[PDB]
Amino acid sequence: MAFRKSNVYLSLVNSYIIDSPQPSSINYWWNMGSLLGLCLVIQIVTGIFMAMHYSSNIELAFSSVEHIMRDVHNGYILRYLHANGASFFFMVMFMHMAKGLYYGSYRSPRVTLWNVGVIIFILTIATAFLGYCCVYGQMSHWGATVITNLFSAIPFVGNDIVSWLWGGFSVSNPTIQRFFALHYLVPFIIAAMVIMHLMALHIHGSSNPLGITGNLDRIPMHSYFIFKDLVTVFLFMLILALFVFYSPNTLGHPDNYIPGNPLVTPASIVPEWYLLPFYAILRSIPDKLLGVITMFAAILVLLVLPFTDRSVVRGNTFKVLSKFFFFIFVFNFVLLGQIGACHVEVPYVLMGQIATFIYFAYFLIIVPVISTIENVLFYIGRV
């Protein structure tokens, strides 16, 4: 046989990126996965070369990022390509997490591939949150205090965990110096979970937008989806180049350029645009303990979704009402992140309760009942 199939090391490359049989009719929404692999390499490579110039002490943490931007040869390219690639990483990931929910990718036999994705989803939120406090900006100090003081709601144990996590009584030198060493570790755990993520993708393969069997028409991965992935790679690196060279500070917040101060709070403590919606779910509940349970459930509610969907068809393509309420839920999340940008004032609190209720009810009431009539409209409409 051929050497690419006979060698021990080249046979793994052969069966994953060269001879892998792909469905012949997957559209551009299936290119999102390779873009996350491209962005994972960008964060790591631009991070190792930028970790050669960063000090994790509370004294030198902020000052060293300026030295990177002013003294390192092409040091501003390093930090804008790493700060904007973090924001571009989440936009592709939401379009990967939304394409899965539309075409019913979570349904069996791909539930493990769905659960490994949620684990990957959490570790990336922590990785981005941990790397955010590394800059030790004014927004990162108080984003660290609020998020870490959230576990003080677990009864009888919270006060010790918070003191154990801070390494002391507040956010000080022991906190930042251990946040950076963790931030260098977790990407190597995500890279290991992606390997386990592609291992569960290889047993059954990708899905197709029609939601039917794809074993009838397959084409090889090389020269078809290697060159089609090259189309989106150049478009992703072009929009990223516009945000890095022409408007670097559009997505971020200007208050992060102030050194962190423990005495004076900012005018408005707001998270980044990708954690903004869950901030509204936390703040909708008028209690402290109940907020944490409600906030974390919104991630965990995705786990029951393979059970609530009672449809015998995968996807929303041939369903009028199941495709109809999807975009409200899409928009409700788009609306959910809008209140979190506005202060806690009349009548944004009332909007904050109804909107987060319809968010949770989609999984637990609408998807199961509309999916039920849809089975009946399908039945008597043909009979």
């Binding site: 975009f327 409200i328 609306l335």
Partner: protein
């Protein structure tokens, strides 16, 4: 090697679909045909077709949450306006 489980895909030769017979395929080498052959009449007529089909699935779902946010924004503007503090104190 050790035995493995049962999956819903095979490989080149035993992919695992149903047996097929009576279906024929024709193709032509791309060195012999002109790409970009119909990019016009596809950027105009084909795109308009697809848009007219899937555009009430996105507009009305976006037409509800735009009027809902606006009547709250222009209501929050009156509640914190000089003419709407008396309604503010009854909702505060």
């Amino acid at each position: 090697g050790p035995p493995s489980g049962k999956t819903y895909m095979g490989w080149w030769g035993h992919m695992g679909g149903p047996k097929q017979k009576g279906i024929t395929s024709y193709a032509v080498s791309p060195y012999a045909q002109k790409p970009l052959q119909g990019i016009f009449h596809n950027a105009v007529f084909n795109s308009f077709r697809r848009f007219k089909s899937q555009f009430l699935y996105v507009l009305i779902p976006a037409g509800i949450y735009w009027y809902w946010w606006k009547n709250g924004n222009e209501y929050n503007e009156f509640l914190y306006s000089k003419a709407g503090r008396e309604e503010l104190e009854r909702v505060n």
